[PDB]
Amino acid sequence: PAPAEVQAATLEKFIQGWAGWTPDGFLANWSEDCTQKTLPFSSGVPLRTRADTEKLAPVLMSLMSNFTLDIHNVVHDAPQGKAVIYALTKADTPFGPYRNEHAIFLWFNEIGDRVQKIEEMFDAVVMQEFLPKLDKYVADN
Amino acid sequence: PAPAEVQAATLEKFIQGWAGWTPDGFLANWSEDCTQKTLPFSSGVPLRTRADTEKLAPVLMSLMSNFTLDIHNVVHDAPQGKAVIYALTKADTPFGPYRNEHAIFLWFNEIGDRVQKIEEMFDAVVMQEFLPKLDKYVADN
Ligand SMILES: COC(=O)c1cc(C)cc(O)c1C(=O)c1c(O)cccc1O
Ligand SMILES: COC(=O)c1cc(C)cc(O)c1C(=O)c1c(O)cccc1O
């Protein structure tokens, strides 16, 4: 893996792109092959590609206003090129208040300047319920 | 923190005590003051003490047989004396088949030979619903 300080810069940039809550800012730290996978695996939530996330992030980030990110724990394994964040999120949506918590596992790419893989355990109801109703709304058009 | 090598060996022992699926073997690697906290915080599951766990462990390990533990991911931050494990579990119970997945955040003690704090995201229904109903049953007797 890349040196600890190179990975750590990428880890910090990843958090700030998330906290910034813009599509380009957040995705800037994804490698081109980076994927997101919802945990637990038993939930059967399909992985999201970088391109998937490019399409989804604008609408979700626009719907969730006053977004806040509270970093509770960061665990960085530089020898393995891996990290974990435990983060608590809040936002306002037109439907009412939004709250979530994410245990997000990260893998850095070999160079160390991007996140190459994400696996995360969080309340995925927006992903399981809103996403299909979003899809079927585009198809009905 | 303790030497990285010692922390890693304790993490290995912690995992093996769990996999061995005996109460004494699993709790051997908990410090005397170790606590467990269920995530997410939004669920408000009260922190469990070592004594709480000493009471809970014999009955769960008796009801779950053919216990399997699969370690999917280990992330070890030796400079911080912290680690995360992602683990998938399965077992048989008299009520039917059991499965779970745990994202477990661990802190080592200063000496490095015990885990002194646990915070874990997992399906907590067995500890939140089963054991209280067991305790009410005893109270009725
Ligand atoms: C647009 O949100 C992100 O960029 C995002 C970012 C991170 C680090 C994890 C996520 O899971 C998401 C996400 O996609 C998401 C979601 O899919 C549903 C609800 C809330 C979310 O944050
Ligand atoms: C019987 O305790 C353990 O071996 C145990 C071990 C670890 C590493 C995390 C846990 O959360 C538990 C647990 O307490 C538990 C539970 O409360 C309900 C279902 C399965 C479980 O493993």
Q: How many CB atoms lie within 10 A of CB A11?
A: 20
Closest to B108 measured CA to CA, from B78, B86, B72: B78
How many Cα atoms occupy the beta-carbon half-sphere of B121 within 13 Å?
24
Q: How many CB atoms lie within 10 A of CB B5?
A: 10
Q: Which CA distances in Å does B131 have to A15, A88, A126, B52, B128?
A: 39, 29, 32, 11, 7
Contact map slice: A 77-96 vs B, CB within 8 A: 77, 79-80, 82-84, 86, 88
Please spell the DSSP secondary structure of B35-71, one letter per residue. EEEEEPGGG-PPPEEHHHHHHHHHHHHHH-EEEEEEE
Identify the sign of the CA torsion B38, B41, B42, B46: positive
Task: Please name the amino acid found at residue A114.
Answer: R
How many Cα atoms occupy the beta-carbon half-sphere of A20 within 13 Å?
14
Max distance between CA atoms of chain B, in angstroms, equals: 51
Give a three-class secondary structure readout of A13-75: HHHHHHHHCCHHHHHCCEEEEEEEEEECHHHCCCCEEHHHHHHHHHHHHHHCEEEEEEEEEEE
At B92, give phi and psi (nearest 5°): -100, 140
With tokens 């003051």, the residue in question is B33
Q: How many CB atoms lie within 10 A of CB B140?
A: 6
Identify the sign of the CA torsion A54, A60, A65, A68: negative
Q: Which residues on neighbouring strands pair with residue B97, listed in sequence order?
A: B92
What angle do the packed helices B50-63 and B131-139 form, to 10 degrees?
90
The one-character DSSP state at A3 is -
User: Residue A46 is encoded by which pair of tokens?
Assistant: 């399909």
Cα distance between residue B49 and residue B33, in whole Å:
8
Cα distance between residue B82 and residue B116, in whole Å:
10
Question: What angle is formed at CA B85 by the lines to CA B96 and CA B79, rounded to 5 degrees?
Answer: 165
Closest to A67 measured CA to CA, from A88, A90, A46, A48: A90
Closest to A40 measured CA to CA, from B21, B72, B61: B72
Please spell the DSSP secondary structure of B63-122, one letter per residue. H-EEEEEEEEEEEEEGGGTEEEEEEEEEEEETTEEEEEEEEEEEEE-SSSSSEEEEEEES
Q: Which CA distances in Å does B26 have to A131, B2, B57, B115?
A: 41, 21, 9, 11
Residues 6+ apart with CB under 8 A from A18: A26, A69, A87
User: Residue B50 is encoded by which pair of tokens?
Assistant: 């070592």
Residues 6+ apart with CB under 8 A from A98: A64, A89, A90, A91, A92
Question: What angle is formed at CA B58 by the lines to CA B51 and CA B25, rounded to 5 degrees?
Answer: 80
Q: How many CB atoms lie within 10 A of CB B130?
A: 16
Determine the residue of A18, A35, A130 to mutate for testing ligand 1's pocket, defined as the one with the most ligand atoms within 8 A of the Cβ atom: A18
Cis peptide bond prior to A40, omega within 30° of 0: yes
With an 8 Å Cβ cutoff, is A111 touching chain B? no
Find the ligand nearest to B85 CA: 2
Cα distance between residue B40 and residue A125, in whole Å:
15
At B37, give phi and psi (nearest 5°): -125, 125
Question: Contact A101/B39, CB-based, under 8 Å?
Answer: yes
Contact residues on chain A for B123, CB-CB shorter than 8 A: 40
At A45, give phi and psi (nearest 5°): -85, 125
With an 8 Å Cβ cutoff, is B8 touching chain A? no
Cα distance between residue A19 and residue A13, in whole Å:
10
Q: A115-121 and A30-39 as β-strands: parallel, antiparallel, unpaired?
A: parallel
* Domains assigned to chain B: 4-139 (3.10.450.50)
Task: Please name the amino acid found at residue B128.
Answer: Q
Cα distance between residue A121 and residue A43, in whole Å:
10
